[PDB]
Design a protein around this ligand. Structure first.
Ligand SMILES: O=C(Nc1cnccc1-c1ccccc1)c1ccnc(NC(=O)C2CC2)c1
Length: 345
């Protein structure tokens, strides 16, 4: 019925509170553990509870990253607490998060299975907000490392996107090596497939680019169940990478010598050229030639979002889009002139 636990608020001072919740049910199972959904008694608010086994040795990295995060496009840690339950005398970490009812995956799938495309204004709204969350976490040196449609939460009434699952997220320091086997199926950057250990935070941007193409195409842009297949699909668009381009990703195989497909010809006829242009500047072999998250926010493809008259198809106003903080703009402070339009309060 009602479950009452003593939970530590995520943000703020470490002062634990009795928190009660009912209607608990399962909404996810995975390598990480299990996610529940329940209703808070004192508010009626829906929450998602992510339950993971707690490493006895070290502190949980996800918890420590999520406790440092505060941004309108990242899912909020409301509380966290510790429980028992299975394994063998082990401790479980429970991350209590704001429940968001939808994901880009489920929504993209509705449209693909209905054979329409997701309206571009949603592509603008969703992609812009993803790039904001990245601008933010990247300013801390934190790379998400598993950006994909299932990790992009959506509230279809407000058009708010929230990035979730920081289970793979890590701070990337120059000269410190990092595992290359992060990141999922269709969204791995070529330098990961090639097994680079010196990759940078632009892998997230490659991934984001894959989401954008997919929202435009109605299907993944680089499918394949092996790296080899994914790589072949990549070369079919970007063309065969050059010696310099290969070096910028890795050592040490020749490839199909196939010339580039004209990016205008990779998408449906009605596709906006600003979107095709933004794709081409995210999906670059050379990981330093890719746009930064903040630069992409400032991209012309998103200009419509900065129009004073724009509204959601449901009639409502657009959600927070311009509350940039100094931290978020740090990559490139002068972009504020473009990012914060005259009407934004
Ligand atoms: O953190 C979350 N999940 C996760 C955390 N870590 C890893 C994976 C997930 C996850 C699990 C299932 C679906 C989407 C994400 C999480 C947080 C808030 N809302 C949702 N909502 C939903 O799942 C919507 C009903 C679809 C998921």
């Amino acid at each position: 019925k009602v479950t009452t636990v003593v939970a530590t608020p995520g943000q703020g001072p470490d002062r634990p509170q009795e928190v009660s919740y009912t209607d608990t049910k399962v909404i996810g199972n995975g390598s990480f553990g299990v996610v529940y959904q329940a209703k808070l008694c004192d508010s009626g608010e829906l929450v998602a509870i992510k339950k993971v086994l707690q490493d006895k040795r070290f502190k949980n990295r996800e918890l420590q990253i999520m406790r440092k995060l505060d941004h309108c496009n990242i899912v909020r840690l409301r509380y966290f607490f510790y429980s028992s339950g299975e394994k063998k005398d082990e401790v479980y970490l429970n991350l209590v998060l704001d429940y968001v009812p939808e994901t880009v995956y489920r929504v993209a799938r509705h449209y693909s299975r209905a054979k329409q495309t997701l309206p571009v204004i949603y592509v603008k709204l969703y992609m812009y907000q993803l790039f904001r969350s990245l601008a933010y976490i990247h300013s801390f040196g934190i790379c998400h490392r598993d950006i994909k449609p299932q990790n992009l939460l959506l509230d279809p009434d407000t058009a708010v996107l929230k990035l979730c699952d920081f289970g793979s997220a890590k701070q990337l320091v120059r000269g410190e090596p990092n595992v290359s086997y992060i990141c999922s199926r269709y969204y791995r950057a070529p330098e990961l497939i090639f097994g680079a250990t010196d990759y940078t935070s632009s892998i997230d941007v490659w991934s984001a680019g894959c989401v954008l193409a997919e929202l435009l195409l109605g299907q993944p842009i680089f499918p394949g169940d092996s790296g080899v297949d994914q790589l072949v699909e990549i070369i079919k668009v970007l063309g065969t990478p050059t010696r310099e381009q290969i070096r910028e990703m890795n050592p040490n195989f020749k490839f199909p010598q196939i010339k580039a497909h004209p990016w205008t010809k990779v998408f449906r006829p009605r596709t906006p050229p600003e979107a095709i242009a933004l794709c081409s500047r995210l999906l670059e072999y050379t990981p330093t030639a890719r746009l930064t998250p903040l630069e992409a926010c400032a991209h012309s493809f998103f200009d419509e979002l900065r129009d004073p008259n724009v509204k959601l198809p449901n009639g409502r106003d657009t959600p927070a889009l311009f509350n940039f903080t100094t931290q978020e703009l740090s990559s490139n402070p002068p972009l504020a002139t473009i990012l914060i339009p005259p009407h934004a309060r």
